[PDB]
Amino acid sequence: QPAPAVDHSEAELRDATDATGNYLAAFQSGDIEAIVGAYIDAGVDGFDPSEEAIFKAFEAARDEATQQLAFSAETITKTRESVAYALKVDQEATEAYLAY
Amino acid sequence: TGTYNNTGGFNDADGSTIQPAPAVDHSEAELRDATDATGNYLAAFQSGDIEAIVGAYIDAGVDGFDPSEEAIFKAFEAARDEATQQLAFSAETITKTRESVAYALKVDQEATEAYLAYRNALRGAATSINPLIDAANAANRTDGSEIEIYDNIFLASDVFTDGPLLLPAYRELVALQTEVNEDLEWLGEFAIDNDADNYVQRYHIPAVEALKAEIDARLEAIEPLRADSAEKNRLAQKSDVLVRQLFLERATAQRDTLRIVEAIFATATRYVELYESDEDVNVEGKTLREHYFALFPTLFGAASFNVGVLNTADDAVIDYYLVWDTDLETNDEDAAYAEEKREFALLTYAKIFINGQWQEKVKYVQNLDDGARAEAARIEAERLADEAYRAEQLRIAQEAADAQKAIADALAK
Amino acid sequence: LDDGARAEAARIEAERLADEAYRAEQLRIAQEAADAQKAIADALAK
Amino acid sequence: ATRYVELYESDEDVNVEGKTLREHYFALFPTLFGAASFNVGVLNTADDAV
Protein backbone atom coordinates (compact mmCIF):
# COMPACT_ATOMS: atom_id res chain seq x y z
CA GLN A 1 0.00 0.00 0.00
CA PRO A 2 1.34 3.48 -0.85
CA ALA A 3 1.97 6.10 1.86
CA PRO A 4 1.82 9.69 0.60
CA ALA A 5 2.83 12.43 3.04
CA VAL A 6 -0.57 13.31 4.54
CA ASP A 7 -0.88 14.93 7.97
CA HIS A 8 -2.95 12.78 10.29
CA SER A 9 -2.85 14.27 13.78
CA GLU A 10 -1.48 12.26 16.70
CA ALA A 11 -4.84 12.65 18.46
CA GLU A 12 -6.46 10.87 15.52
CA LEU A 13 -3.89 8.08 15.87
CA ARG A 14 -4.57 7.79 19.61
CA ASP A 15 -8.34 7.67 19.10
CA ALA A 16 -8.18 5.13 16.26
CA THR A 17 -5.83 2.92 18.26
CA ASP A 18 -7.92 3.12 21.44
CA ALA A 19 -11.01 2.22 19.40
CA THR A 20 -9.36 -1.19 18.92
CA GLY A 21 -7.53 -1.46 22.24
CA ASN A 22 -10.86 -1.62 24.06
CA TYR A 23 -11.70 -4.81 22.16
CA LEU A 24 -8.56 -6.55 23.44
CA ALA A 25 -8.87 -5.67 27.14
CA ALA A 26 -10.73 -8.89 27.94
CA PHE A 27 -8.37 -10.98 25.80
CA GLN A 28 -5.27 -9.31 27.25
CA SER A 29 -6.56 -9.92 30.79
CA GLY A 30 -6.39 -13.67 30.12
CA ASP A 31 -9.38 -14.76 32.21
CA ILE A 32 -11.56 -17.24 30.33
CA GLU A 33 -14.73 -16.13 32.13
CA ALA A 34 -14.20 -12.52 31.05
CA ILE A 35 -13.50 -13.66 27.48
CA VAL A 36 -16.67 -15.75 27.24
CA GLY A 37 -18.68 -12.97 28.87
CA ALA A 38 -17.40 -10.27 26.52
CA TYR A 39 -16.93 -11.90 23.11
CA ILE A 40 -19.82 -14.42 23.25
CA ASP A 41 -23.52 -13.53 23.25
CA ALA A 42 -25.74 -15.25 25.81
CA GLY A 43 -28.77 -15.23 23.50
CA VAL A 44 -32.47 -15.58 24.26
CA ASP A 45 -33.61 -15.26 27.89
CA GLY A 46 -34.18 -19.01 27.90
CA PHE A 47 -30.65 -20.31 27.37
CA ASP A 48 -30.72 -22.84 24.53
CA PRO A 49 -28.10 -25.56 25.17
CA SER A 50 -28.31 -27.03 21.65
CA GLU A 51 -25.12 -27.03 19.59
CA GLU A 52 -26.61 -24.86 16.83
CA ALA A 53 -26.90 -21.77 19.04
CA ILE A 54 -23.31 -22.27 20.24
CA PHE A 55 -22.17 -22.49 16.61
CA LYS A 56 -24.07 -19.31 15.72
CA ALA A 57 -22.56 -17.40 18.66
CA PHE A 58 -19.03 -18.52 17.76
CA GLU A 59 -19.62 -17.54 14.13
CA ALA A 60 -20.78 -14.07 15.20
CA ALA A 61 -17.70 -13.63 17.39
CA ARG A 62 -15.47 -14.71 14.50
CA ASP A 63 -17.12 -12.20 12.16
CA GLU A 64 -16.65 -9.41 14.71
CA ALA A 65 -12.96 -10.30 15.02
CA THR A 66 -12.63 -10.29 11.22
CA GLN A 67 -14.07 -6.77 11.01
CA GLN A 68 -11.78 -5.55 13.81
CA LEU A 69 -8.80 -6.95 11.90
CA ALA A 70 -9.99 -5.18 8.74
CA PHE A 71 -9.98 -1.84 10.59
CA SER A 72 -6.59 -2.46 12.22
CA ALA A 73 -5.29 -3.02 8.69
CA GLU A 74 -6.06 0.56 7.60
CA THR A 75 -4.72 2.01 10.86
CA ILE A 76 -1.22 1.03 9.63
CA THR A 77 -1.47 3.05 6.42
CA LYS A 78 -2.83 6.04 8.34
CA THR A 79 0.14 5.99 10.72
CA ARG A 80 2.67 5.54 7.90
CA GLU A 81 1.31 8.58 6.04
CA SER A 82 1.50 10.60 9.26
CA VAL A 83 5.15 9.59 9.70
CA ALA A 84 6.00 10.57 6.11
CA TYR A 85 4.49 14.03 6.55
CA ALA A 86 6.29 14.50 9.87
CA LEU A 87 9.60 13.75 8.14
CA LYS A 88 8.96 16.03 5.16
CA VAL A 89 8.10 19.09 7.25
CA ASP A 90 11.27 19.22 9.33
CA GLN A 91 13.40 18.26 6.32
CA GLU A 92 12.18 21.42 4.59
CA ALA A 93 12.58 23.41 7.82
CA THR A 94 16.23 22.45 8.28
CA GLU A 95 16.98 23.15 4.60
CA ALA A 96 15.56 26.67 4.97
CA TYR A 97 17.48 27.24 8.21
CA LEU A 98 20.75 26.22 6.55
CA ALA A 99 20.11 28.54 3.60
CA TYR A 100 19.34 31.50 5.86
CA THR B 1 -32.75 -37.28 8.13
CA GLY B 2 -32.67 -38.65 11.67
CA THR B 3 -32.08 -42.05 13.29
CA TYR B 4 -29.83 -43.58 15.94
CA ASN B 5 -27.24 -43.45 13.14
CA ASN B 6 -27.39 -40.53 10.72
CA THR B 7 -25.33 -38.46 8.29
CA GLY B 8 -27.43 -35.30 8.21
CA GLY B 9 -25.79 -33.12 10.84
CA PHE B 10 -27.94 -31.64 13.59
CA ASN B 11 -30.96 -33.77 14.49
CA ASP B 12 -34.14 -32.98 16.41
CA ALA B 13 -34.39 -36.57 17.68
CA ASP B 14 -31.45 -35.91 20.04
CA GLY B 15 -31.91 -32.27 21.08
CA SER B 16 -29.38 -30.46 18.90
CA THR B 17 -31.48 -28.38 16.48
CA ILE B 18 -32.93 -24.91 17.11
CA GLN B 19 -36.38 -24.55 18.69
CA PRO B 20 -38.42 -21.44 19.59
CA ALA B 21 -39.49 -20.72 23.19
CA PRO B 22 -42.61 -18.55 23.46
CA ALA B 23 -43.60 -17.37 26.94
CA VAL B 24 -46.03 -20.14 27.93
CA ASP B 25 -46.76 -20.94 31.58
CA HIS B 26 -45.89 -24.53 32.38
CA SER B 27 -46.27 -25.10 36.12
CA GLU B 28 -43.30 -26.22 38.20
CA ALA B 29 -45.27 -29.31 39.25
CA GLU B 30 -45.48 -30.27 35.57
CA LEU B 31 -41.71 -29.83 35.30
CA ARG B 32 -41.14 -31.99 38.38
CA ASP B 33 -43.44 -34.75 37.11
CA ALA B 34 -41.97 -34.75 33.59
CA THR B 35 -38.43 -34.86 34.99
CA ASP B 36 -39.21 -37.63 37.48
CA ALA B 37 -40.80 -39.65 34.66
CA THR B 38 -37.28 -39.88 33.21
CA GLY B 39 -35.29 -39.94 36.45
CA ASN B 40 -36.81 -43.31 37.33
CA TYR B 41 -35.25 -44.79 34.19
CA LEU B 42 -31.74 -43.76 35.28
CA ALA B 43 -31.86 -45.03 38.88
CA ALA B 44 -30.35 -48.39 37.93
CA PHE B 45 -27.75 -46.77 35.66
CA GLN B 46 -26.85 -44.13 38.26
CA SER B 47 -26.45 -46.84 40.91
CA GLY B 48 -23.60 -48.31 38.86
CA ASP B 49 -24.14 -51.99 39.68
CA ILE B 50 -23.94 -54.15 36.56
CA GLU B 51 -26.35 -56.75 37.97
CA ALA B 52 -29.03 -54.11 38.55
CA ILE B 53 -28.45 -52.72 35.04
CA VAL B 54 -28.82 -56.11 33.35
CA GLY B 55 -31.84 -56.91 35.51
CA ALA B 56 -33.62 -53.64 34.75
CA TYR B 57 -32.77 -52.73 31.14
CA ILE B 58 -32.56 -56.27 29.66
CA ASP B 59 -35.49 -58.67 29.27
CA ALA B 60 -34.99 -62.26 30.42
CA GLY B 61 -37.31 -63.65 27.74
CA VAL B 62 -39.12 -66.97 27.52
CA ASP B 63 -39.32 -69.14 30.66
CA GLY B 64 -36.78 -71.45 29.06
CA PHE B 65 -33.75 -69.18 28.78
CA ASP B 66 -32.43 -69.37 25.22
CA PRO B 67 -28.62 -68.97 25.25
CA SER B 68 -28.33 -68.46 21.47
CA GLU B 69 -26.82 -65.18 20.29
CA GLU B 70 -29.95 -64.15 18.38
CA ALA B 71 -32.06 -63.70 21.53
CA ILE B 72 -29.25 -61.67 23.13
CA PHE B 73 -29.12 -59.46 20.04
CA LYS B 74 -32.90 -58.98 20.12
CA ALA B 75 -32.86 -58.03 23.81
CA PHE B 76 -30.04 -55.52 23.29
CA GLU B 77 -31.90 -54.04 20.31
CA ALA B 78 -35.05 -53.62 22.41
CA ALA B 79 -33.08 -51.90 25.18
CA ARG B 80 -31.48 -49.58 22.62
CA ASP B 81 -34.89 -48.66 21.19
CA GLU B 82 -36.23 -47.92 24.68
CA ALA B 83 -33.25 -45.66 25.36
CA THR B 84 -33.83 -43.87 22.04
CA GLN B 85 -37.45 -43.14 22.95
CA GLN B 86 -36.44 -41.89 26.41
CA LEU B 87 -33.94 -39.54 24.75
CA ALA B 88 -36.66 -38.30 22.40
CA PHE B 89 -38.85 -37.36 25.38
CA SER B 90 -35.99 -35.72 27.28
CA ALA B 91 -35.49 -33.59 24.17
CA GLU B 92 -38.93 -31.96 24.47
CA THR B 93 -38.57 -31.50 28.23
CA ILE B 94 -35.94 -28.82 27.46
CA THR B 95 -38.31 -26.71 25.35
CA LYS B 96 -41.04 -27.03 27.97
CA THR B 97 -38.71 -25.72 30.69
CA ARG B 98 -37.41 -22.88 28.51
CA GLU B 99 -40.95 -21.66 27.77
CA SER B 100 -41.73 -21.79 31.50
CA VAL B 101 -38.65 -19.66 32.24
CA ALA B 102 -39.62 -17.09 29.59
CA TYR B 103 -43.11 -16.70 31.06
CA ALA B 104 -41.70 -16.40 34.58
CA LEU B 105 -39.48 -13.54 33.41
CA LYS B 106 -42.22 -11.70 31.52
CA VAL B 107 -44.68 -11.67 34.44
CA ASP B 108 -42.43 -10.00 37.00
CA GLN B 109 -41.01 -7.64 34.36
CA GLU B 110 -44.53 -6.31 33.83
CA ALA B 111 -45.16 -6.29 37.59
CA THR B 112 -42.12 -4.15 38.37
CA GLU B 113 -42.96 -1.76 35.51
CA ALA B 114 -46.45 -1.24 36.95
CA TYR B 115 -45.06 -0.77 40.46
CA LEU B 116 -42.63 1.90 39.25
CA ALA B 117 -45.40 3.74 37.40
CA TYR B 118 -47.69 3.73 40.45
CA ARG B 119 -44.90 4.91 42.76
CA ASN B 120 -44.07 7.76 40.37
CA ALA B 121 -47.73 8.82 40.34
CA LEU B 122 -47.81 8.81 44.14
CA ARG B 123 -44.62 10.89 44.25
CA GLY B 124 -46.16 13.42 41.87
CA ALA B 125 -49.28 13.66 44.02
CA ALA B 126 -47.12 14.20 47.11
CA THR B 127 -45.19 16.95 45.32
CA SER B 128 -48.41 18.67 44.21
CA ILE B 129 -50.41 18.49 47.45
CA ASN B 130 -48.19 19.98 50.18
CA PRO B 131 -48.00 23.69 49.14
CA LEU B 132 -51.79 24.01 49.21
CA ILE B 133 -51.86 22.36 52.64
CA ASP B 134 -49.35 24.93 53.91
CA ALA B 135 -51.30 27.80 52.33
CA ALA B 136 -54.56 26.64 53.91
CA ASN B 137 -52.87 26.17 57.30
CA ALA B 138 -51.43 29.70 57.17
CA ALA B 139 -54.90 31.25 56.68
CA ASN B 140 -56.62 29.82 59.79
CA ARG B 141 -57.76 31.94 62.74
CA THR B 142 -59.78 29.40 64.77
CA ASP B 143 -58.81 27.89 68.13
CA GLY B 144 -57.61 24.66 66.51
CA SER B 145 -59.97 22.40 68.47
CA GLU B 146 -62.41 21.19 65.81
CA ILE B 147 -60.56 22.56 62.76
CA GLU B 148 -57.18 21.06 63.61
CA ILE B 149 -53.69 22.04 62.49
CA TYR B 150 -52.80 20.04 59.39
CA ASP B 151 -49.68 17.88 59.21
CA ASN B 152 -47.45 17.13 56.23
CA ILE B 153 -48.62 14.14 54.22
CA PHE B 154 -46.91 10.74 54.49
CA LEU B 155 -45.59 11.25 58.01
CA ALA B 156 -44.71 7.56 58.55
CA SER B 157 -44.29 5.77 55.20
CA ASP B 158 -41.44 7.61 53.47
CA VAL B 159 -42.43 7.57 49.78
CA PHE B 160 -39.16 9.13 48.55
CA THR B 161 -37.31 5.85 49.14
CA ASP B 162 -36.78 3.60 46.12
CA GLY B 163 -38.74 0.57 47.32
CA PRO B 164 -41.06 1.63 50.16
CA LEU B 165 -44.54 0.48 51.05
CA LEU B 166 -47.34 2.31 49.25
CA LEU B 167 -50.67 1.29 50.84
CA PRO B 168 -50.31 3.35 54.07
CA ALA B 169 -49.59 6.46 52.00
CA TYR B 170 -52.80 5.98 50.02
CA ARG B 171 -54.77 5.39 53.22
CA GLU B 172 -53.29 8.56 54.72
CA LEU B 173 -54.30 10.49 51.61
CA VAL B 174 -57.85 9.12 51.87
CA ALA B 175 -57.98 10.05 55.56
CA LEU B 176 -56.77 13.56 54.72
CA GLN B 177 -59.52 13.89 52.10
CA THR B 178 -62.09 12.72 54.66
CA GLU B 179 -60.82 15.21 57.25
CA VAL B 180 -60.92 18.05 54.70
CA ASN B 181 -64.49 17.18 53.73
CA GLU B 182 -65.45 17.02 57.41
CA ASP B 183 -63.90 20.39 58.29
CA LEU B 184 -65.34 22.06 55.18
CA GLU B 185 -68.92 21.67 56.42
CA TRP B 186 -68.29 23.56 59.67
CA LEU B 187 -67.35 26.61 57.59
CA GLY B 188 -71.06 26.87 56.70
CA GLU B 189 -72.18 27.36 60.31
CA PHE B 190 -73.80 30.53 61.62
CA ALA B 191 -72.18 30.85 65.08
CA ILE B 192 -68.63 29.80 64.19
CA ASP B 193 -67.41 33.39 64.70
CA ASN B 194 -67.28 33.11 68.48
CA ASP B 195 -64.82 35.83 69.53
CA ALA B 196 -61.54 37.49 68.55
CA ASP B 197 -59.36 34.62 69.78
CA ASN B 198 -61.07 32.17 67.40
CA TYR B 199 -63.05 33.01 64.25
CA VAL B 200 -62.88 32.76 60.45
CA GLN B 201 -61.71 35.18 57.76
CA ARG B 202 -62.48 35.72 54.08
CA TYR B 203 -59.64 33.73 52.51
CA HIS B 204 -59.96 30.43 54.41
CA ILE B 205 -62.78 29.00 52.28
CA PRO B 206 -61.04 29.48 48.88
CA ALA B 207 -57.88 27.78 50.18
CA VAL B 208 -59.83 24.84 51.61
CA GLU B 209 -61.81 24.52 48.36
CA ALA B 210 -58.63 24.56 46.26
CA LEU B 211 -57.04 21.89 48.47
CA LYS B 212 -60.13 19.69 48.23
CA ALA B 213 -60.32 20.12 44.44
CA GLU B 214 -56.64 19.20 44.06
CA ILE B 215 -57.06 16.09 46.22
CA ASP B 216 -60.15 15.00 44.28
CA ALA B 217 -58.36 15.54 40.96
CA ARG B 218 -55.28 13.60 42.09
CA LEU B 219 -57.13 10.56 43.46
CA GLU B 220 -59.14 10.08 40.25
CA ALA B 221 -55.90 9.57 38.31
CA ILE B 222 -54.18 7.66 41.13
CA GLU B 223 -56.83 4.93 41.33
CA PRO B 224 -56.25 2.92 38.09
CA LEU B 225 -52.47 2.79 38.55
CA ARG B 226 -52.89 1.47 42.09
CA ALA B 227 -55.36 -1.16 40.86
CA ASP B 228 -53.03 -2.30 38.06
CA SER B 229 -50.00 -2.35 40.38
CA ALA B 230 -51.80 -4.53 42.92
CA GLU B 231 -53.16 -6.88 40.25
CA LYS B 232 -49.78 -7.33 38.56
CA ASN B 233 -47.88 -7.73 41.84
CA ARG B 234 -50.28 -10.46 42.96
CA LEU B 235 -49.88 -12.39 39.69
CA ALA B 236 -46.07 -12.31 39.65
CA GLN B 237 -45.94 -13.93 43.10
CA LYS B 238 -47.36 -17.20 41.70
CA SER B 239 -44.26 -18.16 39.69
CA ASP B 240 -40.56 -18.55 40.52
CA VAL B 241 -37.90 -18.57 37.81
CA LEU B 242 -35.04 -20.08 39.82
CA VAL B 243 -36.65 -23.51 40.27
CA ARG B 244 -37.40 -23.58 36.53
CA GLN B 245 -33.73 -22.87 35.82
CA LEU B 246 -32.80 -25.75 38.13
CA PHE B 247 -35.22 -28.03 36.28
CA LEU B 248 -33.71 -26.96 32.95
CA GLU B 249 -30.23 -27.83 34.22
CA ARG B 250 -31.45 -31.19 35.53
CA ALA B 251 -33.14 -32.05 32.23
CA THR B 252 -30.03 -31.08 30.25
CA ALA B 253 -27.92 -33.37 32.43
CA GLN B 254 -30.49 -36.14 31.96
CA ARG B 255 -30.29 -35.76 28.17
CA ASP B 256 -26.49 -35.84 28.35
CA THR B 257 -26.59 -39.11 30.31
CA LEU B 258 -29.20 -40.61 27.97
CA ARG B 259 -26.90 -39.90 25.02
CA ILE B 260 -24.13 -42.12 26.38
CA VAL B 261 -26.66 -44.73 27.54
CA GLU B 262 -27.94 -45.02 23.97
CA ALA B 263 -24.36 -45.08 22.67
CA ILE B 264 -23.42 -47.97 24.98
CA PHE B 265 -26.53 -49.96 24.07
CA ALA B 266 -25.98 -49.41 20.33
CA THR B 267 -22.32 -50.44 20.62
CA ALA B 268 -23.28 -53.65 22.43
CA THR B 269 -26.03 -54.41 19.89
CA ARG B 270 -23.70 -53.93 16.92
CA TYR B 271 -20.91 -55.96 18.56
CA VAL B 272 -23.30 -58.86 19.15
CA GLU B 273 -24.78 -58.57 15.64
CA LEU B 274 -21.45 -58.97 13.80
CA TYR B 275 -20.90 -62.49 15.18
CA GLU B 276 -19.60 -64.71 12.36
CA SER B 277 -21.07 -62.32 9.79
CA ASP B 278 -20.23 -61.71 6.14
CA GLU B 279 -19.89 -57.95 6.75
CA ASP B 280 -17.17 -58.42 9.42
CA VAL B 281 -14.35 -57.17 7.21
CA ASN B 282 -10.80 -56.63 8.53
CA VAL B 283 -9.20 -53.18 8.57
CA GLU B 284 -6.11 -51.67 10.22
CA GLY B 285 -4.80 -55.09 11.21
CA LYS B 286 -7.97 -55.89 13.15
CA THR B 287 -11.47 -57.17 12.52
CA LEU B 288 -14.45 -54.82 12.39
CA ARG B 289 -16.04 -56.53 15.41
CA GLU B 290 -12.78 -56.01 17.32
CA HIS B 291 -12.93 -52.23 16.82
CA TYR B 292 -16.31 -51.99 18.56
CA PHE B 293 -15.03 -53.72 21.70
CA ALA B 294 -12.46 -50.99 22.44
CA LEU B 295 -15.11 -48.27 22.91
CA PHE B 296 -16.33 -49.50 26.31
CA PRO B 297 -13.40 -48.34 28.54
CA THR B 298 -13.81 -44.69 27.48
CA LEU B 299 -17.61 -44.79 27.72
CA PHE B 300 -17.35 -46.21 31.24
CA GLY B 301 -15.53 -43.03 32.29
CA ALA B 302 -17.50 -40.50 30.28
CA ALA B 303 -20.74 -41.92 31.68
CA SER B 304 -19.20 -41.80 35.16
CA PHE B 305 -18.50 -38.08 34.72
CA ASN B 306 -22.00 -37.45 33.35
CA VAL B 307 -23.54 -39.37 36.27
CA GLY B 308 -21.43 -37.38 38.73
CA VAL B 309 -22.84 -34.19 37.23
CA LEU B 310 -26.41 -35.56 37.15
CA ASN B 311 -26.26 -36.57 40.82
CA THR B 312 -25.68 -32.97 41.92
CA ALA B 313 -28.24 -31.78 39.36
CA ASP B 314 -30.81 -34.13 40.94
CA ASP B 315 -29.90 -33.30 44.55
CA ALA B 316 -30.19 -29.55 43.89
CA VAL B 317 -33.88 -29.71 42.93
CA ILE B 318 -35.09 -31.77 45.91
CA ASP B 319 -33.60 -29.48 48.59
CA TYR B 320 -34.70 -26.18 46.98
CA TYR B 321 -38.26 -26.71 45.77
CA LEU B 322 -40.03 -24.21 48.07
CA VAL B 323 -37.75 -22.51 50.60
CA TRP B 324 -35.91 -19.24 51.19
CA ASP B 325 -32.83 -18.42 49.04
CA THR B 326 -35.01 -19.34 46.04
CA ASP B 327 -37.40 -16.42 46.54
CA LEU B 328 -35.60 -13.17 47.30
CA GLU B 329 -36.10 -9.76 48.89
CA THR B 330 -38.56 -8.33 46.37
CA ASN B 331 -41.01 -9.44 43.69
CA ASP B 332 -38.67 -8.68 40.77
CA GLU B 333 -34.91 -9.15 40.65
CA ASP B 334 -32.43 -10.14 37.93
CA ALA B 335 -29.27 -9.93 40.05
CA ALA B 336 -29.70 -13.65 40.82
CA TYR B 337 -31.05 -14.98 37.51
CA ALA B 338 -28.18 -13.42 35.55
CA GLU B 339 -25.46 -15.06 37.66
CA GLU B 340 -27.07 -18.51 37.47
CA LYS B 341 -27.58 -18.12 33.71
CA ARG B 342 -23.92 -17.14 33.34
CA GLU B 343 -22.76 -20.18 35.31
CA PHE B 344 -25.06 -22.52 33.37
CA ALA B 345 -23.88 -21.12 30.03
CA LEU B 346 -20.24 -21.46 31.11
CA LEU B 347 -20.81 -25.09 32.11
CA THR B 348 -22.59 -25.77 28.81
CA TYR B 349 -19.70 -24.23 26.85
CA ALA B 350 -17.09 -26.17 28.83
CA LYS B 351 -18.80 -29.56 28.45
CA ILE B 352 -18.97 -29.37 24.64
CA PHE B 353 -15.19 -30.00 24.54
CA ILE B 354 -15.38 -33.18 26.68
CA ASN B 355 -18.14 -35.36 25.22
CA GLY B 356 -16.56 -34.84 21.79
CA GLN B 357 -13.63 -37.02 22.88
CA TRP B 358 -15.77 -40.16 22.87
CA GLN B 359 -18.09 -38.82 20.16
CA GLU B 360 -15.15 -38.76 17.74
CA LYS B 361 -14.14 -42.34 18.55
CA VAL B 362 -17.71 -43.53 18.03
CA LYS B 363 -17.82 -41.57 14.77
CA TYR B 364 -14.52 -43.14 13.68
CA VAL B 365 -15.73 -46.71 14.20
CA GLN B 366 -19.14 -45.97 12.65
CA ASN B 367 -17.41 -44.30 9.69
CA LEU B 368 -15.22 -47.35 9.13
CA ASP B 369 -18.40 -49.44 9.19
CA ASP B 370 -20.48 -47.55 6.65
CA GLY B 371 -17.45 -46.88 4.46
CA ALA B 372 -16.81 -50.61 4.13
CA ARG B 373 -20.51 -51.37 3.65
CA ALA B 374 -21.00 -48.72 0.95
CA GLU B 375 -17.72 -49.48 -0.82
CA ALA B 376 -18.74 -53.14 -1.10
CA ALA B 377 -21.42 -52.28 -3.67
CA ARG B 378 -19.79 -50.02 -6.29
CA ILE B 379 -17.70 -52.83 -7.80
CA GLU B 380 -20.87 -54.87 -8.35
CA ALA B 381 -22.75 -51.87 -9.75
CA GLU B 382 -19.96 -50.98 -12.17
CA ARG B 383 -19.53 -54.63 -13.19
CA LEU B 384 -23.23 -54.89 -14.05
CA ALA B 385 -23.13 -51.58 -15.92
CA ASP B 386 -20.04 -52.60 -17.91
CA GLU B 387 -21.52 -56.00 -18.77
CA ALA B 388 -24.75 -54.37 -19.99
CA TYR B 389 -22.79 -51.79 -22.00
CA ARG B 390 -20.62 -54.46 -23.64
CA ALA B 391 -23.62 -56.66 -24.45
CA GLU B 392 -25.50 -53.73 -26.00
CA GLN B 393 -22.43 -52.69 -28.01
CA LEU B 394 -21.96 -56.21 -29.36
CA ARG B 395 -25.66 -56.52 -30.21
CA ILE B 396 -25.68 -53.19 -32.07
CA ALA B 397 -22.49 -54.07 -33.95
CA GLN B 398 -23.85 -57.48 -34.94
CA GLU B 399 -27.17 -56.08 -36.18
CA ALA B 400 -25.34 -53.36 -38.12
CA ALA B 401 -23.15 -56.02 -39.76
CA ASP B 402 -26.30 -57.99 -40.57
CA ALA B 403 -27.80 -54.86 -42.16
CA GLN B 404 -24.64 -54.39 -44.23
CA LYS B 405 -24.85 -58.01 -45.39
CA ALA B 406 -28.53 -57.36 -46.13
CA ILE B 407 -27.83 -54.42 -48.45
CA ALA B 408 -24.99 -56.45 -49.98
CA ASP B 409 -27.32 -59.32 -50.87
CA ALA B 410 -30.03 -56.89 -51.98
CA LEU B 411 -28.03 -54.79 -54.45
CA ALA B 412 -25.95 -57.78 -55.57
CA LYS B 413 -29.20 -59.35 -56.80
CA LEU C 1 -6.67 -31.48 4.86
CA ASP C 2 -10.19 -30.06 5.11
CA ASP C 3 -10.52 -28.52 1.65
CA GLY C 4 -8.62 -31.39 0.05
CA ALA C 5 -11.16 -33.88 1.37
CA ARG C 6 -14.09 -31.61 0.49
CA ALA C 7 -12.90 -30.98 -3.08
CA GLU C 8 -11.86 -34.58 -3.69
CA ALA C 9 -15.35 -35.74 -2.69
CA ALA C 10 -16.84 -34.27 -5.88
CA ARG C 11 -14.66 -35.44 -8.79
CA ILE C 12 -15.86 -39.05 -8.59
CA GLU C 13 -19.46 -37.86 -8.91
CA ALA C 14 -18.58 -35.46 -11.74
CA GLU C 15 -16.70 -38.14 -13.70
CA ARG C 16 -19.45 -40.70 -13.07
CA LEU C 17 -22.07 -38.33 -14.48
CA ALA C 18 -19.84 -37.49 -17.46
CA ASP C 19 -19.17 -41.17 -18.20
CA GLU C 20 -22.86 -42.07 -17.92
CA ALA C 21 -23.81 -39.26 -20.31
CA TYR C 22 -21.05 -40.28 -22.74
CA ARG C 23 -22.12 -43.94 -22.70
CA ALA C 24 -25.80 -43.05 -23.16
CA GLU C 25 -25.00 -40.76 -26.09
CA GLN C 26 -22.75 -43.40 -27.68
CA LEU C 27 -25.46 -46.07 -27.39
CA ARG C 28 -28.11 -43.71 -28.78
CA ILE C 29 -25.94 -42.77 -31.77
CA ALA C 30 -25.07 -46.41 -32.45
CA GLN C 31 -28.72 -47.46 -32.25
CA GLU C 32 -29.91 -44.71 -34.59
CA ALA C 33 -27.11 -45.53 -37.04
CA ALA C 34 -28.15 -49.19 -37.00
CA ASP C 35 -31.75 -48.08 -37.58
CA ALA C 36 -30.58 -46.00 -40.56
CA GLN C 37 -28.72 -49.02 -41.95
CA LYS C 38 -31.87 -51.12 -41.59
CA ALA C 39 -33.75 -48.27 -43.26
CA ILE C 40 -31.55 -48.26 -46.36
CA ALA C 41 -31.70 -52.06 -46.35
CA ASP C 42 -35.50 -52.07 -46.47
CA ALA C 43 -35.50 -49.20 -48.98
CA LEU C 44 -33.18 -50.68 -51.62
CA ALA C 45 -34.45 -54.22 -51.00
CA LYS C 46 -37.88 -53.00 -52.14
CA ALA D 1 -13.67 -23.13 17.62
CA THR D 2 -16.44 -22.41 15.10
CA ARG D 3 -15.27 -25.14 12.73
CA TYR D 4 -14.80 -27.65 15.56
CA VAL D 5 -18.36 -27.03 16.77
CA GLU D 6 -19.75 -27.14 13.21
CA LEU D 7 -18.42 -30.64 12.41
CA TYR D 8 -20.50 -32.27 15.16
CA GLU D 9 -22.01 -35.50 13.78
CA SER D 10 -21.58 -34.20 10.23
CA ASP D 11 -21.36 -35.99 6.90
CA GLU D 12 -18.13 -34.14 6.02
CA ASP D 13 -16.30 -35.39 9.14
CA VAL D 14 -14.08 -37.82 7.24
CA ASN D 15 -11.25 -39.75 8.93
CA VAL D 16 -7.61 -39.24 7.92
CA GLU D 17 -4.25 -40.20 9.42
CA GLY D 18 -5.88 -42.53 11.93
CA LYS D 19 -8.02 -39.72 13.34
CA THR D 20 -11.25 -37.92 12.58
CA LEU D 21 -11.28 -34.51 10.92
CA ARG D 22 -12.93 -32.94 13.97
CA GLU D 23 -10.17 -34.42 16.13
CA HIS D 24 -7.46 -32.62 14.15
CA TYR D 25 -8.96 -29.20 14.92
CA PHE D 26 -8.87 -29.80 18.69
CA ALA D 27 -5.06 -30.12 18.77
CA LEU D 28 -4.49 -26.53 17.58
CA PHE D 29 -5.47 -24.85 20.86
CA PRO D 30 -2.35 -25.64 22.99
CA THR D 31 -0.01 -23.92 20.50
CA LEU D 32 -2.33 -20.95 19.97
CA PHE D 33 -2.55 -20.46 23.74
CA GLY D 34 1.21 -19.86 23.78
CA ALA D 35 1.55 -17.88 20.57
CA ALA D 36 -1.22 -15.53 21.73
CA SER D 37 0.53 -15.27 25.11
CA PHE D 38 3.72 -14.12 23.37
CA ASN D 39 1.79 -11.67 21.19
CA VAL D 40 -0.01 -10.28 24.25
CA GLY D 41 3.30 -9.93 26.08
CA VAL D 42 4.59 -7.84 23.18
CA LEU D 43 1.36 -5.82 22.93
CA ASN D 44 1.42 -4.98 26.65
CA THR D 45 4.77 -3.18 26.31
CA ALA D 46 3.61 -1.64 23.02
CA ASP D 47 0.57 -0.21 24.85
CA ASP D 48 2.50 0.95 27.92
CA ALA D 49 5.07 2.78 25.79
CA VAL D 50 2.52 5.16 24.24
Residue numbers in the entry:
A (entry chain F): 51 to 150
B (entry chain E): 33 to 445
C (entry chain F): 400 to 445
D (entry chain F): 300 to 349
Please share text taken word for word from the publication where this structure appeared.
The resulting data was used to obtain a cryo-EM reconstruction at 3.1 Å global resolution, which allowed us to build an atomic model of the C. glutamicum PS2 S-layer. Amino acid residues 33–445 could be reliably modeled into the cryo-EM map, which was sufficient to visualize the S-layer lattice contacts. The missing N-terminal residues of PS2 (residues 1–32) are predicted to form a signal peptide for Sec-dependent secretion and are presumably cleaved off and not present in the mature SLP that forms the S-layer lattice. At the other end of the PS2 protein sequence, the missing C-terminal residues (446–498) were previously shown to be important for cell envelope anchoring and are also predicted by bioinformatic analyses to form an anchoring segment on cells. Due to detergent (SDS) treatment during S-layer purification, this anchoring segment was likely detached from the MM and remained too flexible to be resolved in our cryo-EM analysis. The PS2 monomers assemble into tight hexamers within the lattice, which in turn are linked to each other through prominent trimeric interfaces that are repeated throughout the lattice. The hexameric linkages are primarily established by residues 90–110 and 300–445, located around the center of the hexamer and in the coiled-coil MM-anchoring segment. Each hexameric unit is connected to neighboring hexamers through trimeric interfaces, mainly involving residues 194–204 and 213–235. Both the trimeric and hexameric interfaces are formed by a combination of hydrophilic and hydrophobic interactions, including salt bridges and π-stacking of aromatic side chains. The combination of hexameric and trimeric interfaces results in varying pores sizes of 6, 27, and 81 Å within the lattice.
